[PDB]
Amino acid sequence: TTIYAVRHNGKAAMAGDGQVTLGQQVIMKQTARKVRRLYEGKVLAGFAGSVADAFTLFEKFETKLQQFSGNLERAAVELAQEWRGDKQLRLEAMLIVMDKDAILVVSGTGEVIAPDDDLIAIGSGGNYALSAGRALKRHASHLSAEEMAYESLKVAADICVFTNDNIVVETL
Amino acid sequence: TTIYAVRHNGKAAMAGDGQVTLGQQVIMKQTARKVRRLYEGKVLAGFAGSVADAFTLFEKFETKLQQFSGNLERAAVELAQEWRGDKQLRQLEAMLIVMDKDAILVVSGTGEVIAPDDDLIAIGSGGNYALSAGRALKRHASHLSAEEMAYESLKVAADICVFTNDNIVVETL
Amino acid sequence: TTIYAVRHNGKAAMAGDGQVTLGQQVIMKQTARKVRRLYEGKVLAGFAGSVADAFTLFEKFETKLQQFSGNLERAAVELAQEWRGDKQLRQLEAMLIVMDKDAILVVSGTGEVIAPDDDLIAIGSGGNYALSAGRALKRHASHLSAEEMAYESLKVAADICVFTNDNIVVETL
Amino acid sequence: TTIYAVRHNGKAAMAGDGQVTLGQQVIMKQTARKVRRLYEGKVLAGFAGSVADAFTLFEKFETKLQQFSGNLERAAVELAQEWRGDKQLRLEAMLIVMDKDAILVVSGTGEVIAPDDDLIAIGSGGNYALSAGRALKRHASHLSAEEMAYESLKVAADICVFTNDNIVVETL
Amino acid sequence: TTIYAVRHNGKAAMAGDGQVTLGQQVIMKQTARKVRRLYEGKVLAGFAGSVADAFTLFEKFETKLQQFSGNLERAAVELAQEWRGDKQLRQLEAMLIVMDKDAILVVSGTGEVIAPDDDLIAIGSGGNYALSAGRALKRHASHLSAEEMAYESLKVAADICVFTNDNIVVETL
Amino acid sequence: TTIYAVRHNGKAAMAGDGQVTLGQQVIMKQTARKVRRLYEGKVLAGFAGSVADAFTLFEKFETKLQQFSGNLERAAVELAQEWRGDKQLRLEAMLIVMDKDAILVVSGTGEVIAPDDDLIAIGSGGNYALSAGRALKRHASHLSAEEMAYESLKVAADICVFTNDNIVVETL
Amino acid sequence: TTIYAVRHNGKAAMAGDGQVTLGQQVIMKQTARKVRRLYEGKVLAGFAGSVADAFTLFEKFETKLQQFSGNLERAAVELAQEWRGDKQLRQLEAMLIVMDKDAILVVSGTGEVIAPDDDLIAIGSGGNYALSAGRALKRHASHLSAEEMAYESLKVAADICVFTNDNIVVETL
Amino acid sequence: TTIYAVRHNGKAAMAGDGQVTLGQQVIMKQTARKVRRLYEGKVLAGFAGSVADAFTLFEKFETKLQQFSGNLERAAVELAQEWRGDKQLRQLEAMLIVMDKDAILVVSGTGEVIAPDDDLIAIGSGGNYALSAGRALKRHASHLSAEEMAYESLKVAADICVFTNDNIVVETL
Amino acid sequence: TTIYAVRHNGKAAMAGDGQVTLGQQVIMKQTARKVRRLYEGKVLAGFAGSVADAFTLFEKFETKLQQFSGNLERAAVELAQEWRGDKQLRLEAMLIVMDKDAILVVSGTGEVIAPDDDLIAIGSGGNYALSAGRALKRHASHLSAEEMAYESLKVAADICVFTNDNIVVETL
Amino acid sequence: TTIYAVRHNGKAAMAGDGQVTLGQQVIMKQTARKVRRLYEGKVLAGFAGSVADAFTLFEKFETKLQQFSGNLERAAVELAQEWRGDKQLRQLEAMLIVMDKDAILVVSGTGEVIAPDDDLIAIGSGGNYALSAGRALKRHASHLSAEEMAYESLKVAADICVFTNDNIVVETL
Amino acid sequence: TTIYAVRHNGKAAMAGDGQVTLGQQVIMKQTARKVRRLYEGKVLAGFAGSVADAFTLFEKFETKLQQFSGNLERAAVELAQEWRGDKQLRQLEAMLIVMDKDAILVVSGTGEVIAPDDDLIAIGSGGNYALSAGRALKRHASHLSAEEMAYESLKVAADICVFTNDNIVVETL
Structure with a gap:
């Protein structure tokens, strides 16, 4: 699981993957939606648990x-x-x-x-998307918040065995 | 214990074995019924546990x-x-x-x-072994009915898992 | 890691994925080739370790x-x-x-x-997931060759095991 | 400790930090040199141990x-x-x-x-510099190998408590 | 401790040993009676604990x-x-x-x-030793009554289990 | 600690030692009284704890x-x-x-x-006084209950590091 | 984390770093302010936990x-x-x-x-590293104010402790 | 921490050290007062703990x-x-x-x-070291007063135990 | 297993039980002989292991x-x-x-x-036969060494779950 | 076990108890002699082990x-x-x-x-209990010989340590 | 144990304490000499250990x-x-x-x-406490000699660490 959030150029975004893992070994679902809208759609929330x-x-x-x-x-x-x-x-x-x-x-x-x-x-x-997000913010500031959130998740997905590339990006 | 549910070709089927194991070593029952009907026959439920x-x-x-x-x-x-x-x-x-x-x-x-x-x-x-068999069957053997897929997937799991036997009971909705 | 071998209908095949994992958490390589040909090309071998x-x-x-x-x-x-x-x-x-x-x-x-x-x-x-897929395909999809069986068995395992990817290399004998 | 290597545009580089930690708690040195030249200067090597x-x-x-x-x-x-x-x-x-x-x-x-x-x-x-290095290679390919190796170490240094920003970059 | 129940040929029996062990090492009692009659004498019950x-x-x-x-x-x-x-x-x-x-x-x-x-x-x-003895006697010595079966099953267990003695009390229904 | 009870020839007895040990290592008291009279003096009780x-x-x-x-x-x-x-x-x-x-x-x-x-x-x-008490009951039945309880405690005292020979015997 | 308090020469000071660490490995924040003013500004307090x-x-x-x-x-x-x-x-x-x-x-x-x-x-x-620095400064550098002492003690700790950085905020009373 | 009470020659004395240790490794105070007077000066009490x-x-x-x-x-x-x-x-x-x-x-x-x-x-x-010294002193040095025995026994314990110092305070009833 | 030895009145004896236990749970043999004669029959030896x-x-x-x-x-x-x-x-x-x-x-x-x-x-x-042997030596000295060794083993056999009453007594 | 050595007033002594304990619970011997004379009688030695x-x-x-x-x-x-x-x-x-x-x-x-x-x-x-007794006797009972000191120190330890008895053998040099 | 070396103002000094601790709880010696001269007086060496x-x-x-x-x-x-x-x-x-x-x-x-x-x-x-004191002293108290810095840093470590005492011996090259 990886959920990454970033405010950039007045735009706010939060991206999450879709993989669900049982016992740290087996994949049970690939299309989970982990980013939820709260408080009349003015808050983007995410949880790394069940x-x-x-x-x-x-x-x-x-x-x-x-x-x-x-x-x-x-x-x-x-x-x-x-x-x-x-x-x-x-x-x-x-x-x-x-x-x-x-x-x-x-x-x-x-x-x-x-x-x-x-x-x-x-x-x-999360630390892998955080690592890519910081390199992107410094050396690729031409990307939007939604683009940054998507590319950071995609970087973490190719590294983390518990994070897939079925990435959904929500914007505020 | 292995319970497996599959919806295929307009039919729903849930299969389960009958082995009850204590201490992860000893068998006490071979013919248990783990698939139960709930909500006036509209819900098929099973439980890995006691x-x-x-x-x-x-x-x-x-x-x-x-x-x-x-x-x-x-x-x-x-x-x-x-x-x-x-x-x-x-x-x-x-x-x-x-x-x-x-x-x-x-x-x-x-x-x-x-x-x-x-x-x-x-x-x-x-369950993951029956899950593996069922996925292979839904892909390359779609001609099988849902209750046939449920039985065959449980049969594959039983020959691999030491806690699952071939006394398989299939319930169809 | 998953390596699956099958001798079916006068053909022999051995397939493996390409994912290399360190610390059961991080992927370092995706295109590893774990099926090696031995003994003047007359033997296929694979190792699940380093x-x-x-x-x-x-x-x-x-x-x-x-x-x-x-x-x-x-x-x-x-x-x-x-x-x-x-x-x-x-x-x-x-x-x-x-x-x-x-x-x-x-x-x-x-x-x-x-x-x-x-x-x-x-x-x-x-391996147990590819084994279950292979046994189901051996019984209900015997028309598939050994090369398709080993390949299809690995993809089923890849969709369940977090340590197995879809970069599958099938070496036939 | 973090040692990152990258071949990019015919140029090869390897960067390392300088922090030495004892018992995973205390810093004993900040200026260690972890990238060494081997085999008549045709190999850049690094070790994450003692x-x-x-x-x-x-x-x-x-x-x-x-x-x-x-x-x-x-x-x-x-x-x-x-x-x-x-x-x-x-x-x-x-x-x-x-x-x-x-x-x-x-x-x-x-x-x-x-x-x-x-x-x-x-x-x-290392996984943090690897995460930044991959975002840089895809979205900042105008950087040299030496620049890429330096920025990846710097990203990992702000995240890893065992990695400082006394980064030395060696090129082949 | 071993308690074995058997309903055979229209008869019911429950037998138990008498050994009480503390710390899995020392015997404190040899003539304990662990089969108790319940519910106006219509039910036999036993507990393997304290x-x-x-x-x-x-x-x-x-x-x-x-x-x-x-x-x-x-x-x-x-x-x-x-x-x-x-x-x-x-x-x-x-x-x-x-x-x-x-x-x-x-x-x-x-x-x-x-x-x-x-x-x-x-x-x-x-119990698993008396269970094995009881199943063998049920198949190849079906002439024995339920009282002899439960008694003979306990003695087999007593000769294998260090926590089970031969002071066996058979309560029939 | 050892507390031994025995009914013999219509006479009932219970004997206990006096040692108190802290942390299974150090002796803190040698003269503790562990046998108590309960229920109008018709019950002899003892506890092996605090x-x-x-x-x-x-x-x-x-x-x-x-x-x-x-x-x-x-x-x-x-x-x-x-x-x-x-x-x-x-x-x-x-x-x-x-x-x-x-x-x-x-x-x-x-x-x-x-x-x-x-x-x-x-x-x-206790198992040591129990062992001596059973040999005494079979091969020295001429001893009284109070004598049997005292000799069994004394046997256990020379064997158990947590049991001393400050033995008090109570009779019903 | 390091928080150090000192009352020296009629002055009082409390300083803390800004690093927040998760799992004793990864830094999530560098500019945290862990010294909070309490009780109508008459009390300084700090907590080493969450x-x-x-x-x-x-x-x-x-x-x-x-x-x-x-x-x-x-x-x-x-x-x-x-x-x-x-x-x-x-x-x-x-x-x-x-x-x-x-x-x-x-x-x-x-x-x-x-x-x-x-x-x-x-x-x-x-804290023990800032404490050692503070005691050495109290004995051989008593000319420093309480604000410089608390600040200098934290920087010594920051150069030794992997969980303490140089983003030090000194709150004086 | 070491607290020791002795009644000798018509006087009662209770001594204690002043070291406060955290994590069984670091000293935070050397002059604590662990012997307290209770019940309007008629009871001397101390506590090994916080x-x-x-x-x-x-x-x-x-x-x-x-x-x-x-x-x-x-x-x-x-x-x-x-x-x-x-x-x-x-x-x-x-x-x-x-x-x-x-x-x-x-x-x-x-x-x-x-x-x-x-x-x-x-x-x-x-405490067991002060207990050892006090027993030796009561036997072969009975000329010492109770507060002298209390101090000397704490002094011996302090030179052996790493959690007890020589900042000894003796209270006499 | 229990092996008890005693010299008494110029007579020497050593007794052992016959139980063999596997995994501290199951009995595999009841008639083992654990007392052996060594050195031209001038030494009685016993071992509590395999x-x-x-x-x-x-x-x-x-x-x-x-x-x-x-x-x-x-x-x-x-x-x-x-x-x-x-x-x-x-x-x-x-x-x-x-x-x-x-x-x-x-x-x-x-x-x-x-x-x-x-x-x-x-x-x-062994501590149970030792406990009974000491009570016997003090309060039943009329018993021979062979009798003492046999009764001590029999006392330990009724207490120890790993010691049976198939007791063999050897005399020097 | 406790072995205590003391060189006091031109005399040397080494004393030890006699208790042998197995499994930190059971006493097998009470009159062991753990002080052995070495090197043509010019050296006394003792070992706390087997x-x-x-x-x-x-x-x-x-x-x-x-x-x-x-x-x-x-x-x-x-x-x-x-x-x-x-x-x-x-x-x-x-x-x-x-x-x-x-x-x-x-x-x-x-x-x-x-x-x-x-x-x-x-x-x-x-040993630490006999050490405390010996130091107290060295300071407040210096009139005792080395032989009495080593003997008295062991008896103090014997009354506290459950693995040390009063069967003390004092070997003087 | 704490040993500390500092080179300052053209002089080299190495200090160490004298406490020897066994079982992380008991002191057996207070005046050990842990700083040794090697290589014909040209090398000062010390060892945390036995x-x-x-x-x-x-x-x-x-x-x-x-x-x-x-x-x-x-x-x-x-x-x-x-x-x-x-x-x-x-x-x-x-x-x-x-x-x-x-x-x-x-x-x-x-x-x-x-x-x-x-x-x-x-x-x-x-050592880390003496390291903290020494760094503070080299920065804000450079007027102190190397042997003075070595002693004062050991003195600070001794008042914090339970395994280090103030019996400090300083060797100068």
Whole structure:
């Protein structure tokens, strides 16, 4: 799994692959959709874990956003301390959220991280898309956010055994 | 244990073996019936796991279907979230297979709800072998019926997996 | 990694993928060729482990093929007891597969030598998936040649195993 | 540690960082030189382990090259099966070698790998420089091999805690 | 410990040894009686674990026998899902065996409920040894009564299992 | 620790040593009293664990005896299933109880054991006093219960590093 | 991570780096600000763990600062016994550091509360390296202010600790 | 940490060191005060463990003393049973030392309440060394006062144990 | 397995059971003979391990006895340091040897132990026969050495799950 | 086991207990003599391990005492590097203690050679307890001879260590 | 153990403490001399580890110096390769410090030969603390001599590390 988000030239994008793996060994699905639209379509979210846990956190993050009038950082922080508060969800998959202004990553370890260069990724191949995204932002700034997100996922897909090239890109 | 569901040529079939193994070493039963009919004969379900856990998850799922108006996909996800929260029923190992005349779904104890792209999938220790046979059969032997594909895929899994025998029972919707 | 051999209808074939994985996570190569021709082109061999160990065992097996008048079964067995006798290669978890015009054999670090009952067998991460596909094709698609069978069996394994890709090279005898 | 090699437009390069880490926790040196010239300056080699093990393998690889008249692949293969043969050196650090025609990676696990796209890397941050190098080769082919090797190391340096930005680039 | 039940030729019997072992090393008792009569004498039950857990499960099973009009199969299944539902007894590795005039059932901490295909089954350390003896006697010594079969099966297990002695008590129905 | 009980010739006895060991290595006390009188002096009890756990179980066993009119076996059984029921006490030290008619051993594993020959023991050296007690009952039946209990403890004391010879014998 | 506090020559300072590391291998952020101002700007606090836990403990400590008339030592101690009393934060291996105009305190998941003997202390991965630098500067470079001391101590730690960078933010009181 | 109590020649003294160690490797404080006065100066108590756990157990013990009319022995046992039941306060590692003008007691997290036969005892990582010195001193150097024996025994423990220093503070009743 | 030796009233005896257990779970033989005669019938030996290891040590101990003219202690000591010297035999089963004058126990850990009271035992139930043998020597000295050895084994047999009552007693 | 050596007031003594323990649980001997006289009676030596290893090291040390003109310190050091150089005795966790009229030395499997700062040292399970007693007696009971000191130090250790008894044999030089 | 070498202002100094610890818990010596002079007073060497291993590696290094004509760098690398090959002398834990009037070097048991960029470095359990102090001193207290920096850096390490004491001995070239 790899989910990469990038704000570039007033355009925001988030791309994800489609592979689902069981027991770190077998492929069970190739066409999964891991990028979801939240909060009246003003937030692009993604989760590197299971769909049951993803939907549970997506729901709790939506009520936090409605509680704080779309304050992405404050909603993420209280979700993180609520997430760590739960017996069951306290899980090493990470959450990535993004509105028109900020990007954030929320981990089960309670870390809330905003990227320094408006680009970040999660999943088993996230550091590979992050590596390609940074080279693209510096040496290929003529690419759009959607193009950057797609090429970074494609780079990580050829490296990560748990990330395929069935890449879907969502724009805000 | 190997349970396999396939939708082919307008028919739906779910097969399963009958071996019950304890301690990953000893056989105690050879003729178990692992494929059950739910929701007044409209849902075929099976469970890789124990009997009491199967009946528990079977009841919660049928309850979910009546509450969600027969929506298999929405009931499977809600059951998955309920399954993960319950600390007594939480089995990362166990998996659930369900199928109606329209869709097939697998509910993981890890919380994953998977819909097969090719309308065939399997669970259990030998499920990936039946999955391999079924894919080959759907491609190069499409003349076989759904219940024939289900039986032949279970037969291949049984000759490879030590926890799956050839006492195969096929249920057709 | 997946390597699958099949002797079907007077033909022999051995196919392998091309993916090389490090640390069970990262892909370093996609177009590796793991099926090597041995003994004046009369023998096909494959190894599920590393390149260094593959060559070491290939040369030793080639030696004993000259030593035993090209007798695959006896060359395989004494290679197996020397393999186990070496303090180096005893720790290898990968297996070796060899075939000629008349026989298929698998040699292991366990000291195993297996002739398949149906003239088809596989090794590697997804070998059991290609084996299931091959057995289903052998029974319900016997019109396919050995070259198509080995190729189609590998693609089924490639779509399930995360350590096996579709860059499949089929070497026929 | 990260050592990245790339052949591009008839030019060959290999870059390495300078950080040395003890116990995966403390930095002991920042200016180490990890890229060495072998075989009359026709081979660029690098090792992701300790300098004693690096020099030992560098010496055995030089005699193999002189034995096989510069056959990089045949020298690497017999070094790998000799490497696995040794009681002590049988070690999870990897070796990278490169002449004017080929690039190779040799692991203590006996793997001899030639890259598909004339670029590869080793070390704790090697997959990050590999990720940036592939995005650069596709979307910034106007860069030279030396420039590509330097930017890939710099990308991996900002990601890997064991890789610093004291990057030295050697060209063949 | 070994407890073996058999319904053969219109008779039912359940036998158990008497050895109690602590720490898998030391014998504390030799004449324990592990076969208890339940439900107005119409049910025989045995537990391979400790006395405290045996009584706890015996009373709960006796409750559900009154609750379900003496239906063994359904009382066993809901006892199995409550057993698994308790944070206490979920960790128990021992199994429970129950029988009446018409059925034999084994309930486990795994949530298992198994009806034997041949009306004979066993539990405990040497249950598989008594099971093998019972199946051989069922096929080649069918003239023996259920009481002799259960007794002879236990003595075979006692001569192999270090945790099973010859102080065997056969309770017939 | 070793606590041995024996009924012999209408006389009942229970003997215990006095050593207390911390961390299975250091001696902290030599004069501990491990045999206690319960239920109006009609029950001799002993516990092979800590004094806080001993007093807790001694209290729960006394109320069970008063609830069942001195039925030693029924009180022990429901104590055992209550003992296993507790989160904290569910402990590998064992309990030994004895009235004028029966002897019982209750373990944290839920085992309730009456001896076949009216003699039994608990503790790290219990099997050694049990071994000597059985040889004494067969080849030295002229000894009293109190003498038998004392000599069995003394035999176990010279063998078990956690059992000293400060032996106190209580008779019913 | 490294956070170092020092009260020297009538001044108070607390400095921290900016590196955030995941899995002890990968850097996700370089410009984090881990020194937060508390209690109407009269208290500086820092946490070596995650952001969620840092805020949780910051708000609880701020509560007890109002609750105890701004008494750092007593607010720290009762925060420590509540921290240990929570089944959540008991498992936290990181420590908390707090200071006002008169005292410096470190609170741990161990239940520890330590006032430094020389009005200087540090926490985090490289805290002991900044502590050593601070003590050497306190003895042989007492002319430096508390702001320069805390800053220089962090740079020494940054050049040794792989989890501490040079993006140091010094908050003075 | 080493705390040692001795009653000798009509005087009672309890000594302790001042070293606070984290991670069994690093020193953070050298002048801690581990011997506290309780129950209006009539009880000397110390705690091998953390500060927050010490203050928690100190408060529960003083509460136990007021409820049991100053009975040290009955309060120590009741505190021990309360300590074992509380899953949040349960520390098998930690130990508590208490002493009045009549008795000395040690309360273990394992639940043991020990009264010394020779009216001297110690707790902490270096307690057995101070215990060894104190026994030798009470036998062959009885001319020393109780506070002298307490200091000299701590001084011997400090030169042997790496977790105990010579910053010894002696409190006399 | 239990092998017990005792010198008593000028008579020497060594008794052993007959049970052989595989994997600490299953009984494979009930009539094994574990007490062997060595050195012209002047030494009674026993081994608590496998028959292949027993015969190997029995042979090496016989040549040591012939080398030292029947010095039981000196032969046992050099066997023990030779035993620890071997790569394969360096094994937690113990050896027991006995001539007309001394009894010794030799462990794979290099311990050579002569009993203080002319009686000692080895095997999984050795401490139980040792416990009964000491009570018998003190409170039933009218028994012969052969009777004492038999009753001690019989006591250990009813306690140890790995020791049966097929007891053979050999006298010197 | 405890062995303690002391050179005090122109006298030298080495004392040891007699308890032999197997499996850290059971006592096999109570009157063992672990202090052996070496090198024409001019050297006392003791080993905290097994008898076989004690003799092996005793003979090797006696060899190097002849080899080095009875120089204890140099014979000890080269014995230490040969001890570590042997693949056998490298795994020994016990230590060796040697003394003559002028020096005391401890040699370890770690390769350690230590001369005590105060001419007294101990080895074995309770060596640190006898060491503490010896240091207290050296400071506050200097009138005792070396023979009484070594004897009294061992009895203190015997009353604390479960692997050390009171059957103490004091060998004077 | 902490050994620290610094070259400053035309002078070279190497300091070390005197604590010897066994089992990471108990002190056996407080006045050891860990800094040795080699190569006829031209080389200062120290060893974090045991005595016998120090003398062994000291001898092999001096032999390497005579063979390489006093070349510290070439002798250190050759010793490192020799150290890794010897399976009896291979200590991943141990480290070696050497220094002449020109260079400083550290030889790791992991095989690393490091030359400090700032001409100061340290080894041992508390070496990174002395390294932190020394860097701060070279920057903000350059007026101190090399032997003063060596002592003060060891003094800071000793007050933090539990395995390093203040019995510091400084050797100057």
